[PDB]
Design a protein around this ligand. Structure first.
Ligand SMILES: CCCCCCCCCCCCCCCC(=O)O
Ligand SMILES: [Cl-]
Ligand SMILES: [Mg+2]
Ligand SMILES: [Mg+2]
Length: 132
């Protein structure tokens, strides 16, 4: 199952190419400006379902799911998606589908950091988090 090394509170330390990723999702300019200034905390826990909670001054989000079971998600930019989280070679892989579009957020552990790779339409964003 998901490694217990994911569990905990993680703080964003680096983000590369977020603005073009948000653009590819359809996010408007003023929201992107705030999204690029945000430094969220991500809290991963498990109590039956796995929960991934994101906290920031601009927006908070939360998803709770079982691996491999499609669920309804509301994203930080207020998309209403059908999403599935899978585990592949230790990476926690989230696909979101809405309005015939798809994006993936792969989260993996690298030397104790958590690396999120976000992909939309060939645009790739990398966000690196350190455990608190
Ligand atoms: C994530 C909260 C702050 C961002 C607010 C701007 C709205 C666009 C959000 C795009 C989806 C977020 C992808 C997050 C990946 C990650 O967990 O690092
Ligand atoms: Cl913030
Ligand atoms: Mg940066
Ligand atoms: Mg950018």
């Amino acid at each position: 199952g998901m490694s217990n090394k994911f569990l905990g509170t993680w703080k964003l330390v680096s983000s590369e190419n977020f603005d073009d990723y948000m653009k590819a999702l359809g996010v408007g300019l003023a929201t992107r400006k705030l999204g690029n200034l945000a430094k969220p905390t991500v809290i991963i826990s498990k109590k039956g379902d796995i929960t991934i909670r994101t906290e920031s001054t601009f927006k908070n989000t939360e998803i709770s799911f079982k691996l491999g079971q499609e669920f309804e998600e509301t994203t930080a930019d207020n998309r209403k998606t059908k999403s599935i989280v899978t585990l592949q070679r230790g990476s926690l892989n989230q696909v979101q589908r809405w309005d015939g579009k798809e994006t993936t957020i792969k989260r993996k552990l690298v030397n104790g950091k958590m690396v999120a790779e976000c992909k939309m339409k060939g645009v790739v964003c990398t966000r690196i988090y350190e455990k608190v």
